[PDB]
Amino acid sequence: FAEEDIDRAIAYLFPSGLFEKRARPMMKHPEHIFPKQRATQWGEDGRPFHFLFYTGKQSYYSLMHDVYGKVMQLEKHRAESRDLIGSRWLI
């Protein structure tokens, strides 16, 4: 039994004709319905898990930390850049 069968079974057992599908009955996995950004960020002793916890954007700044370190090694160490075409930056 899979997510596809579950959604089909719920539609048979609880027929709803509401036009908006967010308002219809749902038996989904908690990961989908519940906001993902609500996870504990520190332990029992109160010490945060990530060294950038106190910035308030630990994941944005952890990513900007990695990309800035890569840039420094490439600049220190020292062709066409269009390895990929028909692509866009993620929104």
Residue 51 binds another protein (CB under 8 A): yes
Is residue 9 within 8 A of residue 26, CB to CB? The reply is: no
CA-nearest of 30, 26, 27 to 39 is 30
How far, in Å, CA of 10 to CA of 21, rounded?
13
Task: Name which position in 32, 46, 88, 89 contacts another protein (CB under 8 A).
Answer: 46
Q: Write out the binding residues for another protein, residues 1-40 only, by CB under 8 A.
A: none
| Residue closer to another protein, measured from CB, 8 or 57 | 57
DSSP 24: S
Q: Which residues bind another protein (CB under 8 A)?
A: 41-42, 45-48, 51-57, 61, 65, 68-69, 72, 75-76
